[PDB]
Copies of this chain bind each other. A is one copy, B any other.
């Protein structure tokens, strides 16, 4: 039967059948619960809201993301999200459909084991497999060589791969992501005067970040231009009806990816981490990695990200070196596209973790096929 590919990263759970060029169902990986006791008795009130329903009733619900950073903070909530995906979004019984999932590199095998145990004892799927997100991104890009810098809403990692073999010793994982960028946008918005403190407020700030933020090419000159000419100002309309005028915040919210000193973490920026991962590899395969850097995730859509990354990595890297920042469209769903390609490949169909193999061995079987 047709295998199912589900990517729970990038803040929004994207799932669909293998082979398609786009995911069938996409929605935020969000679980909502009521905050006030209701008075309506005739109206059907459900104890928990998941995904699009929780988004619709965002104003009167508490929102908890199950996936934090790259680890699970509420296995009950993630089980609820998976049930929603399998029964209310894709409309397919997992009892007869093999499933494929994604997980960020350098993640607890405690998390991986709970993932496998949930999917095998709750949904009893005939087969299962767990793959690295950025490897799937490289699958989607087609090329079999080149560093992939994935940066979802929870994780920011790079896994350089050369000529068919990965480089597990050069994997760098970084914490700055969509959630941290949203938090910085919160802080800078209350700096301007618009105070946001609520899960609903957080989602509105995330929408503002998606639809207004961009990365400059030279931060100092951009800041001076925005503070002097005041021509970069843009407006946004909140659901309450009050307009928000945003100035320096546009290129200060996503500047933390390159200057994490704004958020205070000592870790170097995304470009510096990519460059360090490049130098961590062998001295001979450096140029092919330079020429085939791939971006993905949900925190890469920003305008000018490719130009800024190219400029910074050119400044860091030695001269006489061509660094083509491959940033194709659909980076948001590139991970899912790669997962679909991997599941559709016939050779990979034999490397799955079958139910019989699971019942025979268990946790070992799962950290032995990854």
Contact = CB atoms under 8 A, between A and B. Distances in A.
Interface of A: 34-45, 57-60, 62, 69, 71, 106, 108-111, 132, 135, 144, 161-170, 173-175, 187, 190-193, 195, 197-201, 204, 237-243, 261, 263-267, 279, 281-287, 290, 317-321, 342, 345, 347-348, 351
A360 to B, nearest CB: 17
A190 B45 contact: no
A345 B170 contact: no
A226 to B, nearest CB: 14
B163 A284 contact: no
A39 B132 contact: yes
Contact of A239 (B58, B163, B240, B283): B283
A200 B38 contact: no
A63 to B, nearest CB: 9
A111 B191 CA distance: 10
Contact of A144 (B40, B167, B347): B40
Contacts of A261: 35
B173 A190 contact: yes
9 contacts: A35-B261, A39-B135, A39-B166, A58-B284, A60-B163, A108-B191, A110-B192, A198-B265, A241-B317
Contacts of A37: 165-166, 168
Given A193-B108, A283-B59, A144 B43 contact: yes
Contact of A42 (B38, B60, B204, B348): B348
A287 B41 contact: no
Most chain B CB neighbours (cut-off 10 Å) among A35, A62, A164, A318: A164
A106 B189 CA distance: 10
A171 to B, nearest CB: 8
Given A108-B192, A241-B318, A283 B43 contact: no
Contacts of A342: 41
Contacts of A321: 241
A238 B321 CA distance: 11
